[PDB]
Scaffold this motif. Structure first.
Motif, PDB file in Angstrom:
ATOM      1  N   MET A  40      34.409  46.911  36.283  1.00  0.00           N
ATOM      2  CA  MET A  40      35.072  46.438  37.003  1.00  0.00           C
ATOM      3  C   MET A  40      36.307  46.811  35.267  1.00  0.00           C
ATOM      4  O   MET A  40      36.020  45.988  34.003  1.00  0.00           O
ATOM      5  N   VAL A  41      37.354  47.625  35.447  1.00  0.00           N
ATOM      6  CA  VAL A  41      37.952  47.734  33.667  1.00  0.00           C
ATOM      7  C   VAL A  41      38.820  47.102  33.729  1.00  0.00           C
ATOM      8  O   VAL A  41      39.599  46.572  32.752  1.00  0.00           O
ATOM      9  N   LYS A  42      39.520  46.404  34.842  1.00  0.00           N
ATOM     10  CA  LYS A  42      40.774  45.047  34.390  1.00  0.00           C
ATOM     11  C   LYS A  42      40.732  43.951  35.838  1.00  0.00           C
ATOM     12  O   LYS A  42      40.349  44.193  36.404  1.00  0.00           O
ATOM     13  N   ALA A  43      41.312  43.131  35.700  1.00  0.00           N
ATOM     14  CA  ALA A  43      41.495  41.514  36.215  1.00  0.00           C
ATOM     15  C   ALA A  43      42.626  41.231  36.240  1.00  0.00           C
ATOM     16  O   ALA A  43      42.871  41.532  34.957  1.00  0.00           O
ATOM     17  N   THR A  44      43.219  40.271  36.524  1.00  0.00           N
ATOM     18  CA  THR A  44      44.003  39.055  37.020  1.00  0.00           C
ATOM     19  C   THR A  44      43.273  37.877  36.392  1.00  0.00           C
ATOM     20  O   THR A  44      44.559  36.844  36.931  1.00  0.00           O
ATOM     21  N   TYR A  45      42.342  37.400  36.865  1.00  0.00           N
ATOM     22  CA  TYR A  45      41.904  36.410  36.608  1.00  0.00           C
ATOM     23  C   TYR A  45      40.472  36.140  35.708  1.00  0.00           C
ATOM     24  O   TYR A  45      40.165  37.088  35.107  1.00  0.00           O
ATOM     25  N   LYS A  46      40.858  34.814  35.073  1.00  0.00           N
ATOM     26  CA  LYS A  46      39.771  35.197  34.076  1.00  0.00           C
ATOM     27  C   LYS A  46      38.091  34.629  34.788  1.00  0.00           C
ATOM     28  O   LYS A  46      37.423  34.842  33.375  1.00  0.00           O
ATOM     29  N   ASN A  47      38.038  33.615  35.364  1.00  0.00           N
ATOM     30  CA  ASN A  47      36.706  32.971  35.864  1.00  0.00           C
ATOM     31  C   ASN A  47      35.862  33.471  37.353  1.00  0.00           C
ATOM     32  O   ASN A  47      37.053  33.723  38.065  1.00  0.00           O
ATOM     33  N   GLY A  52      43.570  36.355  42.879  1.00  0.00           N
ATOM     34  CA  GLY A  52      43.537  37.528  41.531  1.00  0.00           C
ATOM     35  C   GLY A  52      42.838  38.789  42.972  1.00  0.00           C
ATOM     36  O   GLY A  52      43.455  38.930  44.130  1.00  0.00           O
ATOM     37  N   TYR A  53      43.368  39.977  41.327  1.00  0.00           N
ATOM     38  CA  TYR A  53      43.386  41.174  41.618  1.00  0.00           C
ATOM     39  C   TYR A  53      42.225  41.862  40.315  1.00  0.00           C
ATOM     40  O   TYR A  53      42.506  41.425  39.943  1.00  0.00           O
ATOM     41  N   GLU A  54      41.198  42.753  40.966  1.00  0.00           N
ATOM     42  CA  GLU A  54      40.354  43.465  40.431  1.00  0.00           C
ATOM     43  C   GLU A  54      40.735  44.794  40.582  1.00  0.00           C
ATOM     44  O   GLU A  54      41.069  45.268  41.197  1.00  0.00           O
ATOM     45  N   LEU A  55      40.902  45.765  39.249  1.00  0.00           N
ATOM     46  CA  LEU A  55      40.070  47.438  39.496  1.00  0.00           C
ATOM     47  C   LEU A  55      39.272  47.952  38.612  1.00  0.00           C
ATOM     48  O   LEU A  55      38.347  47.617  37.799  1.00  0.00           O
ATOM     49  N   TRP A  56      38.456  48.295  39.653  1.00  0.00           N
ATOM     50  CA  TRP A  56      36.504  49.288  39.509  1.00  0.00           C
ATOM     51  C   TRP A  56      37.601  50.653  39.408  1.00  0.00           C
ATOM     52  O   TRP A  56      37.775  51.517  40.516  1.00  0.00           O
ATOM     53  N   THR A  57      36.311  51.301  38.517  1.00  0.00           N
ATOM     54  CA  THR A  57      35.652  52.780  38.328  1.00  0.00           C
ATOM     55  C   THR A  57      34.989  53.160  38.270  1.00  0.00           C
ATOM     56  O   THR A  57      34.147  52.385  37.256  1.00  0.00           O
ATOM     57  N   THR A  58      34.640  54.524  38.348  1.00  0.00           N
ATOM     58  CA  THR A  58      33.407  54.569  38.133  1.00  0.00           C
ATOM     59  C   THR A  58      33.306  55.047  36.538  1.00  0.00           C
ATOM     60  O   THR A  58      32.476  55.362  35.767  1.00  0.00           O
TER      61      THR A  58
END
Ligand code: HSM
Length: 171
Positions: free
Chosen positions: A31-38, A133-139
């Protein structure tokens, strides 16, 4: 009542959840980025989230997932195992969501907003006792695919984006 990208006819071709789950068997997804903290499991101000899968079950559309993560509660990497099943959300006929089940029986159902062979944009509806929120996942945490990054930035507009897994996680 559902997100505007949750249009199976328009976008279903890029929202194949079972394909995305099985992709975690072959390569680690970070998970390289997200919009939420918890997150109830990963903790507060969580960072360094990654996952790999095994035990593919075609009948069930399930895998076993081993996670790694960090949070502001401990200096050390943490680990957890959860079952993950591809399920249907928003009236889709082909599975477009991930149903995570923890060892204690807690369930989280997140939705695949956009996916390509090495990356996912995942939506957290915020109805599981957690933040929407949203999440970005990458290999590959160093080389982020533009298609997923652009889709993440599009769907996550109006929020605060932050980094979660970066190379700093490996010191
Ligand atoms: N949005 C991430 C939900 C989750 C699943 N497992 C632990 N936390």
């Amino acid at each position: 009542n559902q997100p505007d990208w949750a249009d199976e006819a328009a976008n279903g071709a890029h929202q194949d959840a079972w394909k995305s789950l099985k992709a975690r068997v072959e390569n680690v997804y970070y998970m390289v980025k997200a919009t939420y903290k918890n997150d109830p499991v990963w903790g507060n101000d969580f960072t360094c989230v990654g996952v790999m899968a095994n035990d593919v079950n075609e009948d069930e559309k399930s895998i076993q997932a081993e996670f790694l993560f960090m949070n502001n509660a401990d200096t050390n990497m943490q680990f957890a195992t959860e079952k993950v099943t591809a399920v249907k959300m928003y009236g889709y006929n082909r599975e477009n969501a991930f149903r995570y089940e923890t060892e204690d029986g807690q369930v989280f159902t997140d939705v695949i907003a956009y996916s390509d062979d090495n990356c996912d944009v995942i939506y957290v509806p915020g109805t599981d006792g957690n933040e929407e929120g949203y999440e970005l996942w990458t290999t590959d945490y160093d080389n982020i695919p533009a298609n997923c990054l652009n889709k993440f930035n599009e769907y996550a507009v109006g929020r605060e984006t932050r980094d979660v897994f970066t190379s700093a996680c490996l010191e």
